[model samples]
Target: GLTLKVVTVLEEPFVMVAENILGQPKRYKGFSIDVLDALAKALGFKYEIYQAPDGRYGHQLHNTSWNGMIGELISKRADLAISAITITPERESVVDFSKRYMDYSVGILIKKGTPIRTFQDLSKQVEMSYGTVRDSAVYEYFRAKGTNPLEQDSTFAELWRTISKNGGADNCVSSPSEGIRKAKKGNYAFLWDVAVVEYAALTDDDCSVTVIGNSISSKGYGIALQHGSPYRDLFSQRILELQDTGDLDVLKQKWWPHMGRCDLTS
Candidate 1:
């Protein structure tokens, strides 16, 4: 490919926007960027990167249309969509995804003084509101009721029941910062990709919130492409090679920021 176009959303530890040294449309630095750089070098492909205009992973609409990076790919606006975007069954039906480069689980972010410990505690009480980013995989997971629903897992079903009772998607925040801000104020708890939450909860310097409880769900993220894109094979191959050589994990450590003051030093 000659100067492929990449669409991404700015996500910390995954793809973070950076101040350019000179006048350029934009610049980025993060784990996803590093992996993309490696793929480019190995495959002899050149690339140009741009952010998704609305910064959403997107969901299907009534007309079977999507509205974010997935939409961008389907319209051939970009050759690939990269970020911390998840690989879900519904999404895979519309776009091709490379082998997973990073794995993560859902976790909770609660203000430090909250009495919450696990999903069990949160589900049993309605004292504080809880939610994830609207229309996100995290949100979909909690509300899952489609064929092969999370209802198969007893605990997951109960949690979803409580979430629905709390007004479901209405409880959701539009952005991660909004969710975190609510959490910092001590009235809301935010559920999100655990690794992302760890970096975000500590990024503000005050350590107002902390990730707690065992992980609630697990999945991995992959680079997304338009259906039938020939580049899928190239990406999936190189990513596995990187993982085998431990290169991917090394990059993972490099981009994952250090825990802040609230972290247990031991």
Candidate 2:
């Protein structure tokens, strides 16, 4: 491959946009970027990176059309997409994934002073409003459980704005960062990946968010590619090599500083 096209969506600590240098093309840096750099060096390929046009990992539409990075790959617009793309039966049928690189789950983010703790109890109450990123797995999960989340089409910023501006009836159930923000405010709970949530919580002195309940679902994150792409085998092989050498764990530590700190039992 000659400078393959790479697509991604920023998801904090996973894929973050880097500030421009005095004289260089725009760049991105984070766990995904580091892994991509290593893969490029090991596989003897160069790549140019870009964000997904729609800023989503990918979701299937009602008419069987796909959107986000998955759509980009199927359209042959990108060769590889590496952010925190989860591997699932629905997505795998249309796209290929490398071996799992990270493990995460759907976890809840509760603000510091909230009386709620148990996940099982969240649905029983109607006084608290819940919100999540529209089309996210968490949003879908809630919908499957017969709960309606105040869903937004784009970034977590929208979720945060609505909750803070609207007060108590407004609670967030979005990304880790948004959850952390709400959690810090002592009024809301954000459901998301525990690792990401804890990292944000631990790193931010102002954030007093605590993780509550068990994970709703487990997820295995992988690099997404078009089905039958020549790069899958090579990429999967490199991932295993990195895993065997403890490089993947090291990368996780670099990005996720509070990895084992948050106790679900607490």
Give the C-alpha miss distance for residue 207 in model 1, angstroms. Answer: 2.4
**How much is the lDDT of residue 69 in candidate 2?**
95
Clashes of 2: 2
RMSD of each: 2.9, 6.4
109-156, model 2: which lDDT tens digit per residue? 666555666655554444565555544865555544432234332223
Best by lDDT: 1
Clashes of each: 0, 2
lDDT of each: 0.80, 0.72
True-structure lDDT of candidate 2: 0.72
**Candidate 2 residue pairs that clash:** 109-190, 111-183
The deviation in Å at residue 108 for candidate 1 is: 0.6
